[PDB]
Amino acid sequence: LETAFLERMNTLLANADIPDLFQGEEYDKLLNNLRNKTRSLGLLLDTEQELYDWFVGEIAKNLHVVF
Amino acid sequence: LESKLTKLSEIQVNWVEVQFYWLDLYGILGENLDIQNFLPLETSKFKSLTSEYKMITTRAFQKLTIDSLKMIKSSLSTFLERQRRQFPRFYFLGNDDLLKIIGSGKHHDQVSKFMKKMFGSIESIIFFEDSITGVRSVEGEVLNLNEKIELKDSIQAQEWLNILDTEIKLSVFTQFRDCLGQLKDGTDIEVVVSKYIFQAILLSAQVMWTELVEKCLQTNEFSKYWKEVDMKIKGLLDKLNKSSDNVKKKIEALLVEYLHFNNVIGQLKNCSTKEEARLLWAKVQKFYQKNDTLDDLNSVFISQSGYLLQYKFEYIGIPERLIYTPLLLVGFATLTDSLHQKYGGCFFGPAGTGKTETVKAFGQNLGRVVVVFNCDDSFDYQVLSRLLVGITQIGAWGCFDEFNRLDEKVLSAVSANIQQIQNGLQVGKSHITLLEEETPLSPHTAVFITLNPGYNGRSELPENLKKSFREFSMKSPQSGTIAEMILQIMGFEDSKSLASKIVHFLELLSSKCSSMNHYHFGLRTLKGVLRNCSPLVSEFGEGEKTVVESLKRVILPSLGDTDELVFKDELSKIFDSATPLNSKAIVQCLKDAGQRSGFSMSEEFLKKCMQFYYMQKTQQALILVGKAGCGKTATWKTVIDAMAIFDGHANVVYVIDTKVLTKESLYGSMLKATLEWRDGLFTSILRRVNDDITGTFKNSRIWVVFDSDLDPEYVEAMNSVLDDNKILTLPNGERLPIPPNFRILFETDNLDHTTPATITRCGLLWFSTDVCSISSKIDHLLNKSYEALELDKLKDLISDSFDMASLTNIFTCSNDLVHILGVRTFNKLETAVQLAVHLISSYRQWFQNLDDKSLKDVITLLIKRSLLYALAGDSTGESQRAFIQTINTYFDSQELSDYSTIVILSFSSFCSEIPSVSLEAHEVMRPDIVIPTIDTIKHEKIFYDLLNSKRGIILCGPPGSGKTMIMNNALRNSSLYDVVGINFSKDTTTEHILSALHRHTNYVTTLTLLPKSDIKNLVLFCDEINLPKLDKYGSQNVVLFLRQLMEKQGFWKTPENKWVTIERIHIVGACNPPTDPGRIPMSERFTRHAAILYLGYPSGKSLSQIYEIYYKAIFKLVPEFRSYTEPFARASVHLYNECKARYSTGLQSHYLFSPREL
Amino acid sequence: ALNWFKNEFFVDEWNIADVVANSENNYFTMASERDVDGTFKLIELAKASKESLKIIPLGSIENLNYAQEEISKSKIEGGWILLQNIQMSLSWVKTYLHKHVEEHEKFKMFMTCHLTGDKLPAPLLQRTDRVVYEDIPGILDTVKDLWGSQGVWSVYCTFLLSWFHALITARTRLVPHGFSKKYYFNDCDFQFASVYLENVLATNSTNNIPWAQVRDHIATIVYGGKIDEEKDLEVVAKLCAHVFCGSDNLQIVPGVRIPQPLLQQSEEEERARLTAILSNTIEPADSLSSWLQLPRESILDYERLQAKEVASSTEQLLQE
């Protein structure tokens, strides 16, 4: 509808995820959910950087956008 | 324990703020009785807050409370509204100020500080024995009240405020009546002028003048009264020089009035007939007096052109009286004509012609202080209607300066309110309705507008609104008359000839100079040169040398290079001569400050500093303009330090970039969700310096520099700040005075988009060329790099390493070479010096075990490498070979070829630096795999070396050339840097950049934006810097923000109005060449602070090599095709080259090939 | 020659009053060029027909809500309503007003939109009537309308002021020779000059009329407010001296002479005599040049260019 949609899609496609959505409370909730999923899946990650890069790898592997 | 001390100071400040909030709440509700019943839920909340405050105080004696106080502050909105209804003048006060003024139920001393904001001409009240006995105007004159006003503990603010408001008019009328009785007794005005308040003498003299003129006009003689008036003026001028400063100002205003009287008498005497005399008597303003009215505050009325107005008898103090030009009289007549039918007088014309001052003079002649507002783009319908309903209840005259600045929708919407106000004044309505609420309507109020047509970015008046106004043009002011009477009143021996000379000189200077945009020599420059010639009389004396020195000090810094010669020739040919000022102490202070800061005191820089000091000696707002990197920041910083040394006054500076913040964050924004006002950044600074809680801002100069382009929408909201009003007018009615020590500077590069309204109103300082020598600049950079860090021996030898005689010739010959991202060589010395110093400081740990010849040769090789990669570091291949050949020519020294590089401690090349790669089959899916070539390893080494030098690196090249590729290769193998990926678009904001760093940084107060890692730096990689688009006035938000983050090493936080300091964040950017379609040019003010590199397309042979390694690694899968790895690589390279050559961009907009396709 | 077609084959013409009186449509849209408005005509029309208008300008959400409430109440009970500058609320007029109009015997709605402004929606314009307001080309027609809109000295001064206003309004439409720029003198200037004339005539009861005072105040203050160039000011002062000379014999028009009032007549027969001397005057064909005291060449140039554009347009029109 408006160029902010294009900017959001551009941010999603340039990197692998949007830093805008996960800010503050949402970022903390995503960190907790990612920690729970990683512990449930069976990996040993506790630092923020490795967990977030695993999230980046997952979203790069399992998301395709067709324009 | 610096962090602990900062935490303790912050806790103390928060405790003080909480104590102030609780004091206000206790004053409004917690102390006064029978006040809880208005709002019971708010009363219970106040009781709970009182319990919380008592618990907090007990805990402190032995956060959440602040949040609760902020939540309950919104519950006081209707109480504040009804309190403002109780006293109409509270609409000029802020909500916190209104809390302070209501809660002070027994102190009765908080009122004096806010009375300047309320009344506009009174800043203090004399108190004795808990009673009001004296009122003091802004000029220090004390008005004795007619009757002392008693104060009780029970009475709150508004009742005694209303009593004081009535007593002000009563005392002014009593003093006027006594002065008029004394004048009718026949005494001279020289004894009267030292007795009463100035307004009494002024209006009584006007009444006597019009009565005696009428008496003489009944007959046909004028010589007797003309002689009497002339002798009165001469006696007053004789009395001027032997009295106090307050009496001096009063006498000056009396001379203005009596000189206007003499002008009118001279106009009437030269008449022949009687009809023309009656015409000129009818046109001029007359001050009659009612003889039969038993009322006392309406006994004097003003007649002009047959119309009548009522004197409000409001205290005005001593203002700066305006010289009565004929245009001023015609404007007064048209305002009287507009006000006879309760319409609105409108003034329009070119800027700097005397419109707002004319309205203020009319209001002072009618004896009511005129409140002035500055219309802005943030003024929507709600705030404008609030200001209108505020000024209708008060009855004071509102003057909406720059009425064109409003949005056209708001201009159409306010038409109904304006017509309603006019009709209510016409029909004498007791109440009018605005904002869906009935309010009383005073029968004294009126509205004026001063629009400025013909300037870009300004909407036009819709006709339903313009029909409700009377517009009058002010095209040609009478500058000669103003100059003549002002020179006469300052006591100059010759006045008429001097005024004619200065006006004709200004006209000749305007006509016979290089006609560019920023030249304007109208009335504002004349007023400025007179205000600068006023204090020079102590060191020079009244005459011609004073006025020529004032003309020089006002005009010369604003001229170019040849225009200075034209100005000097004109001043020599129109005036007699030019004893010069000694200026020994100030130049000694400047030289000491320059030696302390390491700058070189060249003739041009010293002249610019002298001009800046002499301009700022009386001018309050200055604008510094010139090319990029002339030295404006250095100039004003070193003159601030020199001033601090000279005067002993402490100096604090606030560096604000105007285009990096929105208007709602700079000046403020009204939260529509709760109808509450949030202060911006500049408003917060002004409020902090005006309130002066700490007490240390009284004897300290305050400087605010605006280090960005002069956007009209961002700077024309300061129209009422920079001019003679010196009042900031917020949308919510707050009126912040500007202290005399508050000074504003401007720092930009162009004045094409600026307007003459904000050019004339500020002092100007044009930088024709650079201020410093290139060798002196290199010496300064070396000094700062040495101070940034045996050591003395190393510094001496590296200083002896430079040979500036060949360096300046190399710099002058470097201009023939082609460049991208067009920047002058004067800016590129920073990267050269910093790279050389960093390299020597890094290699000094192996510089203690070799001979001097090898050391000198190695250092000269490093200097050659730094100079090459700085001056020609953003060039093509053949250009780089040409420049390395040139620098080898211009320096016995160690030879440096296209591939010369030190090895870890001798000379080598990249022939032996290529490592063999065992590229396995399954590793081609990793995007980070690199095939090292000559250019790849060279670019990676220089990129890592530049990034280790604590600088900014901008990598340029065609798309797909390998910019982020070599950056990832360089920063991947290093365990000290982290890479963050930010990609820009057509609309990227500062909030996006801050949001992409929130998950990578941590906020710590000491503010400071540290990286999350305590050992690894962070490299802010902003890709595609050219993509963020311009706004409608030639500026870029993101590029200016990055320039702020690189030079000032910080930025201003928007929602908290606090400065942060960056510590361990490096800025690295990538951009396509500007000639690429879709890409846009970028300012030199940002490329000055960063080094630029070219990353071109590799040669076709290099592509064939890297892709035959790729094809061997890909044919490791199938072993019987190992001999065909090269034909496929050659076919792929040839196909890519032919596809690029055939399908160009001119066919389709997306035919942009790259090695990424391969 | 251009007006000959209308004067010959066309026997009737319509004003705003005849349009609003002879239309079954309850909605009207008025239009005018830049820097001219016709709100006062609708105000006077409503006052003549004994109806209460409501001027509700658009541009803000509060004004839009007030307009919604007022239009609902006026539909329920009656009365008139007016909307000013509807182009500043394009989204509102595209959605809500289109829905309302597309969906009482004393309910009329008036809207004003600029011709040079943004394009109004096609269905809303087609659904409502259209009226264009502009200055009257006829000088004598302008004098007639100003006379019909309104001791004997007051009536005489009002007559002279109406003639002055019509003459200066006829002159201000000549761009290259009439003035330096394009100026417009609306009704507010006439109201101010009339109020000043009545104020002067009321105060000076000696019957020694200070015509210099009136001349200078009209040329400088009332009608000279919008004047920017000095040449426009001096030509306005010259025409004011020509018309407001205040002599016993007065020739404002080369074919019309106005007797001065006597000290024994009442206002009604004076108004009748002034109407009689107005109506007997016939407008010459060259009135654009002879009445304004102008050289012929510029007047013929302007007329030739106007007629050339008009004839080219009608020749392009008539070929299909």
Ligand SMILES: Nc1ncnc2c1ncn2[C@@H]1O[C@H](COP(=O)(O)OP(=O)(O)OP(=O)(O)O)[C@@H](O)[C@H]1O
């Ligand atoms: N007299 C001097 N001696 C030594 N160095 C000087 C002198 N004058 C200026 N310079 C150098 O000039 C450089 C650029 O000047 P400055 O920092 O004031 O630029 P600026 O006005 O802020 O630039 P811009 O408008 O492009 O943002 C400074 O780094 C400073 O070292």
Ligand SMILES: Nc1ncnc2c1ncn2[C@@H]1O[C@H](COP(=O)(O)OP(=O)(O)O)[C@@H](O)[C@H]1O
């Ligand atoms: N007697 C006077 N007549 C005209 N102008 C004067 C007189 N005295 C001072 N001035 C100058 O006129 C200026 C008025 O500025 P003005 O044109 O009203 O600003 P704006 O156009 O923004 O309202 C002041 O800066 C003042 O120095």
Ligand SMILES: Nc1ncnc2c1ncn2[C@@H]1O[C@H](COP(=O)(O)OP(=O)(O)O)[C@@H](O)[C@H]1O
């Ligand atoms: N050792 C190398 N030498 C030259 N080119 C290379 C080398 N390694 C990779 N490349 C090419 O560089 C490209 C990377 O370009 P990239 O840096 O993404 O462009 P941009 O900087 O515009 O994003 C890859 O597609 C690859 O084909």
Ligand SMILES: [Mg+2]
């Ligand atoms: Mg102003």
